[PDB]
Write a protein that binds this ligand. Structure first.
Ligand SMILES: Nc1ncnc2c1ncn2[C@@H]1O[C@H](COP(=O)(O)OP(=O)(O)OP(=O)(O)O)[C@@H](O)[C@H]1O
Ligand SMILES: O=C(O)c1cc(-c2cccc(Br)c2)nc2ccccc12
Ligand SMILES: [Mg+2]
Length: 264
C-alpha cells in the first residue's frame, strides 16, 4: 500500500538500537509523521525479526490516547519502515535531562497517564515490558504516550531474547528469566516514579552486575525530599513478589496520585 517514494524525509527525531527515527511528510495528504527505519541485516544478526513483527501486530490494534499510533509499514530490499504518529514534544528522557527532576504534579500526572495506558493494554492481556523514559513520548498538549512495542508480548510469558540493555526498569522475575505477567509493568511504574522525583532510577550502578544484585535484593533508599505519600506508592510497587504489587486501580486511586495528578 505504501512505498518510500510517497514521503518527504526530514530531520532525525531520534535513534535507538537498530536504526534512526525521522520526521517525514506524506506528499499527497501532507500528513506529518515519524518514520522508524530498521536495517534488516542488523535485525537478522541480533535475532529480533519476531520482536519487530509483534511490535507491528500488537501496536496497530491499539487505540488509546496515551499510546502512540502505528499507522502501517512497508519494506525495501534492505530496510523496514514503520509509519508512526509523531510526538512533537520529544521524550520523557530529554525532559528529565533538562529539568533534572520533576515535581510531584508532573510525576503524578505522568504516572496517571501511564497507568491508564497500561490498564488499557492489560485489558487485552498485553504487557509492554520496556517502559523506559526513552520510550515515553510527549504529544502537542504535553501528554505522555507509550512508544516502542518491540518487547511487548501477550501475558503470561517467558523471556526468549537476551535483554541486552540496562536492567534498570526490569523486575526480578524477568531478568531471572522466570515466567511473568502484567505485574512486570507495575514494578517498572515504580522505578519511573522514583526516577521522576529523584531523577535517577533506584538501582543505578556502574555495572549491569551490581544493578542485578540491587534489583534481586530490592535495595533502594530515598533522598530526604521524597514525601511519605510518594514513598508509600513507590514501596508498594517495588515488591519482589509480583503477587504483592497493587492493581492499576490502586495506583490510580492512591491518595498521593489523586491529590497531585491533574485529570481532564
Ligand atoms: N513518534 C515519535 N516521535 C518523536 N520521536 C520519536 C518517535 N518515535 C521514536 N522517536 C525517537 O526515536 C528514538 C528511538 O525510537 P524507538 O524506541 O521506537 O526505537 P528503538 O528503541 O530502537 O526500538 P525497539 O526497542 O523496539 O527495537 C526514541 O527514543 C525517540 O527519541
Ligand atoms: O528480508 C525480509 O524479507 C525481511 C522482511 C521483514 C519485514 C517485512 C515486513 C514487515 C516487517 Br515488521 C518486517 N523483516 C525482516 C527482518 C530481518 C531480515 C529480513 C526481513
Ligand atoms: Mg527504545
Amino acid at each position: 500500500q505504501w512505498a518510500l517514494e510517497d514521503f518527504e524525509i526530514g530531520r532525525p527525531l531520534g535513534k535507538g538500537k537498530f536504526g534512526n527515527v525521522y520526521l517525514a511528510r506524506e506528499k499527497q495528504s501532507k500528513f506529518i509523521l515519524a518514520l522508524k527505519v530498521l536495517f534488516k541485516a542488523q535485525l537478522e544478526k541480533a535475532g529480533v525479526e519476531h520482536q519487530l513483527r509483534r511490535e507491528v501486530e500488537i501496536q496497530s490494534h491499539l487505540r488509546h490516547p496515551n499510546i502512540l499510533r502505528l499507522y502501517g509499514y512497508f519494506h525495501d530490499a534492505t530496510r523496514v519502515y514503520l509509519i508512526l504518529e509523531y510526538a512533537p514534544l520529544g521524550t520523557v528522557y530529554r525532559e528529565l535531562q533538562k529539568l533534572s527532576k520533576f515535581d510531584e504534579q508532573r510525576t503524578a500526572t505522568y504516572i496517571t497517564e501511564l497507568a491508564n495506558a497500561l490498564s488499557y493494554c492489560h485489558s487485552k492481556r498485553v504487557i509492554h515490558r520496556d517502559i523506559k523514559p526513552e520510550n515515553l513520548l510527549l504529544g502537542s498538549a504535553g501528554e505522555l504516550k507509550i512508544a516502542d512495542f518491540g518487547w511487548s508480548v501477550h501475558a503470561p510469558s517467558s523471556r526468549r531474547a537476551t535483554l541486552c540493555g540496562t536492567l534498570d526498569y526490569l523486575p526480578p522475575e524477568m531478568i531471572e528469566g522466570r515466567m511473568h505477567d502484567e505485574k512486570v509493568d507495575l514494578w517498572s511504574l515504580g522505578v519511573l516514579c522514583y526516577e521522576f522525583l529523584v531523577g535517577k532510577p533506584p538501582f543505578e550502578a556502574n555495572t549491569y552486575q551490581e544493578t542485578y544484585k540491587r534489583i534481586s535484593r530490592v535495595e533502594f533508599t530515598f533522598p530526604d525530599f521524597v514525601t511519605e505519600g510518594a514513598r508509600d506508592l513507590i514501596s508498594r510497587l517495588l515488591k519482589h513478589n509480583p503477587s504483592q504489587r497493587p492493581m492499576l486501580r490502586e495506583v490510580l486511586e492512591h491518595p498521593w496520585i489523586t491529590a497531585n495528578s491533574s485529570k481532564p
